[PDB]
């Protein structure tokens, strides 16, 4: 099993845990 | 930062959660 979040696994993961709050700023 | 913490090393949920907003 591979524990590192790279690329779109790191992205797909932020989308999950951030929820409505999101990340990469908010517009606005 | 994140890529280092979560891709080069391994990051706990709460590490990962602090790059949100």
Residue numbers in the entry:
A (entry chain B): 2 to 29
B (entry chain A): 1 to 21
Please give me the paper's original passages concerning this structure:
Insulin is a 51-amino-acid protein hormone with two disulfide-linked chains (A1–A21 and B1–B30) that is responsible for the maintenance of metabolic homeostasis, with an impact on cell proliferation and regulation of ageing. It exerts its functions through binding as a monomer to the tyrosine kinase-type IR, which is an (αβ)2 heterotetramer in which each individual αβ extracellular chain comprises L1, CR, L2, FnIII-1, FnIII-2 and FnIII-3 domains. Therefore, we undertook further mutagenesis-driven studies of insulin, focusing on the TyrB26 site that we assumed might be the critical structural pivot of insulin conformational activation on its receptor.
